[PDB]
Amino acid sequence: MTAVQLIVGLGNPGPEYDQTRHNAGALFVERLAHAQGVSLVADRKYFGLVGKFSHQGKDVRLLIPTTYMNRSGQSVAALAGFFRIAPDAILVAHDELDMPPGVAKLKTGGGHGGHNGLRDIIAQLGNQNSFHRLRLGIGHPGHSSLVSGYVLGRAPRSEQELLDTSIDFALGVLPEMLAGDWTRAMQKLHSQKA
């Protein structure tokens, strides 16, 4: 029903955070941009890297915020506000503790689950949580005390590859996602196995 006009990939900026688990969303958008031949331009006005492509006669934008994760909403609100994009036309890709590496799922709305990127977006969008999420499994360390070090760590080879695989799976349902056919996207996606 509602075409996606903005795809956001969450991550922390800088060499220290590059390739860490918490940057799974940004990796997805990087991959997507490369596959679609889209340049990601550093644009201070949107506090991030912004790309654009055309699909079915509409501009679709790609955003990787270059705020810290906990201020990602500032970036999403700037770009969405400027182009008058409603939450229902936004997809946010992010790392998900509650699914293992190799699993990707889609979800509309819900809470943030302790993810400070998602939390700031919900807050900045005038407390609207009804955007869509691409949830990219990164596994869970096994206790709450270990979570912060875990998401800011670099995963071993095996887990990284599994993430790459889930990103591949998600890119396979891009047509459905872009069209806003979440029902069909979920059917195709939630039946894949790494």
Ligand SMILES: Nc1ncn([C@@H]2O[C@H](CO)[C@@H](O)[C@H]2O)c(=O)n1
């Ligand atoms: N439950 C939970 N707790 C924390 N975090 C992230 O860990 C990072 C480093 O502390 C923070 O930026 C949270 O987004 C998270 O993603 N989920």
